[PDB]
């Protein structure tokens, strides 16, 4: 099922919930230890990891270097080693059972830095920095290469994407998206990098485009019904689900589903309550 961790509504949240696309109902599971929004989720060895973010609360706004592990049949969170630096609005991807933490912010600082986590060693190590400073960056893995997509450098919002080659440790710029997107939902379905929604500095977006590696081409597909940035995204059963987000007025509880065979979006559920900036992954 689809797990959503953290988020923001009036304050950063501790929620961990699981959506069942088969039966349509939500399961409520163990709270995060520390509230977090602007984090990312991923899955390694069936375990669910919560990376970076910040605790934005009535009492303080502390960027998080934390990494925490949830076990789906222990229902327990356990802390792992922390990152080199705090990363709010981080992006993460998984290659060869290792987690890559990309970009994000600490206070004023917008990172280009990138580090990698070793689950059987509980260690982080620096790797090559990005060409670009990026927060609200979407991250995807395709053919074991790591793609950093869009985001915000502190002054401009980005349509650029760059590719990380783990066996050469060098970042390379690729073809830019057709749309400037910070806080988009970025994932991989079929064999295309999808970028859904986001904020371009004027308006939240409902457009969606996808990157074909072999032709180095971004093409637009069917747009979502509801504009959103700071959304969660994952693919389940070969279909894209996007979760919550902010539309410039409202914290969304809408969950939309894209079927790639028909190129259509349809609303599948509403979250328990609207929230933005969640970490989403499936197990």
């Amino acid at each position: 099922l689809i797990y959503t961790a953290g988020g923001y509504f009036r304050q950063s949240l501790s929620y961990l919930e699981a959506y069942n696309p088969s039966d349509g109902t939500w399961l409520r599971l163990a709270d995060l230890q520390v509230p977090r929004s602007g984090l990312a989720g991923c899955v390694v060895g069936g375990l669910l990891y919560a990376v970076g973010g910040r605790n934005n609360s009535p009492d303080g706004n502390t960027d998080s270097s934390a990494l925490d592990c949830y076990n789906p049949m222990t229902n327990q969170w356990s802390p792992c080693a922390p990152m080199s630096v705090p990363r709010n609005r981080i992006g993460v991807g998984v290659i060869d059972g290792h987690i890559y933490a990309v970009g994000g912010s600490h206070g004023c600082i917008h990172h280009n830095s990138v580090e990698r986590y070793e689950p059987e060693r509980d260690e982080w190590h620096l790797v090559a920095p990005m060409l670009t400073r990026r927060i609200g960056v979407g991250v995807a893995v395709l053919n074991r290469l790591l793609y950093a997509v869009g985001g915000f450098d502190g002054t401009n919002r980005l349509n650029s994407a760059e590719c990380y080659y783990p066996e050469r440790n060098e970042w390379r710029m690729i073809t830019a998206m057709n749309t400037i997107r910070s806080g988009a939902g970025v994932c991989v379905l079929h064999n295309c990098i999808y970028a859904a929604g986001g904020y371009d500095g004027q308006d939240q977006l409902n457009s969606v485009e996808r990157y074909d590696v072999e032709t180095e081409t971004w093409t637009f597909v069917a747009p979502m019904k509801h504009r959103r940035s700071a959304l969660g995204i994952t693919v389940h059963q070969g279909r894209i689900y996007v979760l919550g987000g902010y539309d410039g007025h409202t914290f969304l509880d809408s969950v939309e589903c894209y079927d790639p065979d028909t190129d259509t979006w349809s609303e599948v559920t509403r979250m328990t309550s609207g929230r933005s900036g969640v970490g989403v992954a499936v197990t």
């Binding site: 923001y8 929004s37 602007g38 934005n56 609005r89 609200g136 915000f152 910070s182 806080g183 904020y199 940035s229 700071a230 902010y246 410039g248 914290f251 933005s276 900036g277």
Partner: peptide
């Protein structure tokens, strides 16, 4: 924040 709502 116009993008996350925070």
């Amino acid at each position: 924040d116009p993008e996350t709502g925070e």
